[PDB]
Curated annotation (Swiss-Prot), chain A:
Organism encoding this protein: Bacteroides phage crAss001
Subunit structure: Homododecamer. Interacts with the Cargo protein 1. Interacts with the major capsid protein.
Cellular compartments annotated: Virion
Highest taxon of the lineage: Viruses
Classification of source organism: Viruses, Duplodnaviria, Heunggongvirae, Uroviricota, Caudoviricetes
Disulphide-bonded residues: none
Protein function: Forms the portal vertex of the capsid. Probably involved in head assembly, genome packaging, tail attachment, and genome ejection.
Span of the entire protein shown here: 52 to 101 of 806
UniProt name for this protein: Portal protein
From Swiss-Prot, chains C, D, E, F:
Role noted for this protein: Forms the tail multi-ring barrel with ring protein 2, ring protein 3 and ring protein 4.
Top-level taxon of origin: Viruses
Miscellaneous field: The barrel is composed of five stacked dodecameric ring structures. Podoviridae-like phages usually possess only one such ring. The tail is thus rather long.
Source species: Bacteroides phage crAss001
Presence of keyword Protein transport: no
Subunit structure: Homododecamer.
Name this polypeptide is given: Ring protein 1
Chief location: virion
UniProt-annotated location(s): Virion
Protein keywords: Viral tail protein, Virion
Length: 46, 95, 226, 226, 226, 226, 95, 45
């Protein structure tokens, strides 16, 4: 779900929400995808 | 090496405000509404207590450890240069 | 506040004042007036009594509790969502969103037609006679003593029955003790400092404490390990 | 304002002034004048009553309510669009855009010929007698007491019946309490600080709350998650 | 504190005050009041008795001990987890997390319905008579003597029975000795400086000694050798 | 301290004081009181007598020696490990590590149930009558003379029997001699400077002197040659 | 060579606050709440004592050993350079 | 004496720093969006 742009807030903290708003939820920034796409893009070119 | 510590007085939190909730609206707005005409400040305004109770900044409990950590870092790179050059196995020869 | 607000009766302050022979003409009336004046001027929130009381809104208006002085918050009874202040100028007036509230007198102007709301307000701890009840913190008692003494000596000096130096000394002492009292009642205790610590250090900032009753303001912000 | 404006009648100030033997010839006639002077000189908006009242425009002119002191806003009754100040020098004068208005006395000069306009205006809270009604905030009462005292002592000092030190002390005390009252009636409450915060932190700024009646000045600015 | 708090009875201060012929009308009745005033104005924690006492919570409320002045901490009796200050405005009020508490008078408002809580609180060391018991530190005794002397001379100077130079000298001496006593009762001992050192130098910081009763605030932070 | 603390009797100070005819009404009582006051105010550790005395702990409490004034250290009798100060608020209180100690009165609160501990404390060198015994260092004697003279002249000036200039001169002289005495008793001697030298210059820092009785604090740090 | 030493007066820790638990919450928050209207500060406020007892900042027991360390380090490279060319074995000759 | 003196005042609002702060934020997000796709500015020219 991190590769598909879903941040689970129960996974990076304790929760004391469910609705899709950055005042109380958190925005996910896809920075892991580019490093994985090198390597599945290099296996295509071997 | 802890950080830099700011000595803070709460003499100008407005009336009817908790210091817990006063600082919370100062986190996010970066503005703290203060009260310069509180009853605790009637001395410094009317001239009955000294004027350094309304002014002169905020003190800092700070220590130059980052200067001392940097002094001990430069000493290690001088010995690791010395120990390399005493054996004849330098860093260019190590890489 | 580090210490606890143990309540004591008004005539304690007259027990302390009337030791000064120049203050023997004070009465419970003057004590009551200047005690209310001092309590308001300092505006210390730990001196007022926190209460919660639910009311029903008729049509953008509601009846307000009799002893109310200041409102901490207003929320909806069913949902628990807190109400911000009104920025509108044409609230209930129709022509031919976010809930809000507004209070002037014994009436609360909210932006909702027919609902019940919970109000967290502050009032005065009253006496069995029905009189204001003051803390016994000797810093508070001393500062109130000096407040009443300063008013009395100001009046006498206006008539010319007190030397200017005496009034100047009284004002100086009262100013210092006012500062001392303000720092005494406002500086956080150890547990309040834990709440402030949990509020300050936050890797993921929390900026929605108002929607709840500032309940999780001091809640510690935990980060899962990976 | 943190505190609430609980209303009390004007002679509550004469309860407090006439403790002073040098202010015993003050009257409700003098209290009314100096109280109105203090209300205006302080210019605190929380002391006035918020009212909304609709009028019709005959031809670029309309009759104004009797108790109006200031206008929060004017809008068109049918659209709800708010009006701005009229910079035009030749409004209702023809030769051979966005609506606006202007108010001088009992007449409001709008730029519209025939329409009904909603005016949100401020007035004074009155008593069962046609007299002003003052807040019971002891800071406000003490500052008004000091205002009346300072005026009366200025008169007596012009006569030479008061020592200059007495008047200097009175002016000093009044100045400090005037600042104190100004801050007390101005500094926002927690619920008002939520409105201010929602106005302040906006990734996409909102700059058109004047068109509405500043209804959405304080709404939170929610960004969707992508 | 380097020194120890050896306790002595209150009239040890009247041993010393009444050497002065101008303080011969002081009494134990006056000594008690001014001593309590000095104890509170100084606010030194080493002067109070550390006590621990458990109570039960009926429903978000509990009865408080009689002699309590301040609360060091509150924790749950079964878990040992410490409590924080309650920022919530609607604790025991329902609509239609981490535990906390609040204390005003003889009542403690916790966020738990039915549980026993341990309170570590501070009180005053009493005598065989129900009177305060003071430290015999000659710095403390001299400062309290100067406090009582300064108050009595302030009264006599308001009366005009003391020269202003005398009162100025008394205030100067009292101010210096107040600073001296404050530092004497605050500056850590060698054993306390070990605790402070262990707290200060931490390669891996410890920031959760509030959960415990600050038991491990002073433990050394031992790093294994690799 | 460079010099040695040779002890002499209290009436030496009265031999020096009573040379002033304005100080002929002093007695051994006043000498005793102001000598204790001066010894405490200066707080010079070389004036107190170092003693060591073992006690037995019953259950987190122990009886304290009668003459104790300040504790240098507390350790365990069997292991010799020193005890730091208590940071805990719930020491002996159970629910349903590193040793520590705490001292208030005649009782020592340690974190161990049943063990014996050694306490290194400081007391006063007493006389065969049973009275305090003072050093003969003429700087100390002169400063104590000036302390007693300053208190006496302050009392007289309060009555108005001494010129203000005389009291000002006495205070100035006492202030300078107080500084001189503080430097006399605190500046290290040559052997103490060797200890400080061995403590300062350390290629491998030693940060565990407290576990021992600060025994190796002045031990020279030797480096093997290679 | 130890660090720089801050001289810290505890005249303004708040009432009823232990110095261990006061410094514990300044480690964390980097805010130290101080008490400027304590009874220990009545003389510098009312002007009976010197006003410099409330201010002027905290002194530093700082001895410049970092300059004296670098003077030897720059001297030790001078001799190792001077010893190198006396026998004709430069730093490129050992490279 | 400040009526023949004191110099000429300025209504000087600092918008030149605030304009440059939003410009550095636009250079940063157009850069960070390039790293998300793996299409750098070297890749577009």
């Amino acid at each position: 779900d991190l590769l598909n742009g879903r941040l689970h807030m129960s996974d990076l903290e304790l929760v004391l929400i469910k609705a899709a708003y950055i005042p109380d939820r958190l925005q996910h920034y896809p920075i892991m995808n580019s490093k994985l796409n090198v390597l599945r893009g290099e296996e295509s070119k071997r | 090496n802890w950080g830099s510590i700011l000595e803070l007085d709460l003499s100008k939190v407005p009336k009817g405000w908790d210091v817990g909730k006063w600082m919370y609206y100062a986190r996010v707005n970066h503005i703290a509404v203060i009260d310069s005409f509180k009853e605790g400040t009637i001395g410094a305004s009317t001239g009955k207590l000294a004027g350094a109770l309304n002014n002169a900044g905020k003190g800092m409990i700070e220590t130059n450890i980052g200067n001392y950590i940097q002094q001990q870092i430069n000493l290690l790179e001088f010995i690791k240069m010395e120990m390399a050059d005493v054996a004849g196995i330098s860093k260019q020869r190590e890489g | 506040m580090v210490n606890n607000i143990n309540w004591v009766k008004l005539p304690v302050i007259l027990d302390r004042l009337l030791r000064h022979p120049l203050l023997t003409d004070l009465n419970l009336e003057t004590a009551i007036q200047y005690t209310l004046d001092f309590i308001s001027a300092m505006g210390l929130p730990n001196v007022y009594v926190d209460k919660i009381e639910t009311i029903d809104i008729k049509e953008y208006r509601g009846e307000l509790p009799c002893d109310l002085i200041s409102i901490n918050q207003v929320r909806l009874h069913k949902n628990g969502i807190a109400l911000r202040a009104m920025t509108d100028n044409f609230n209930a007036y129709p022509t031919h969103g976010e809930p809000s509230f507004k209070t002037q007198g014994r009436v609360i102007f909210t932006s909702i037609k027919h609902e019940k709301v919970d109000i967290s307000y502050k009032a005065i701890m009253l006496d069995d006679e029905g009189l204001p009840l003051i803390p016994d913190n000797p810093i508070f008692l001393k500062t109130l003593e000096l407040y009443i003494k300063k008013e009395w000596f100001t009046i006498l000096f206006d008539m010319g029955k007190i030397s200017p130096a005496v009034l100047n000394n009284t004002q100086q002492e009262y100013a210092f003790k006012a500062g001392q009292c303000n720092n005494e009642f406002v500086i956080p205790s150890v547990s309040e400092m834990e709440a402030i610590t949990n509020m300050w250090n936050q890797l993921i900032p929390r900026v929605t404490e108002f929607r709840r009753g500032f309940k999780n303001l001091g809640d510690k912000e935990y980060i899962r390990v990976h």
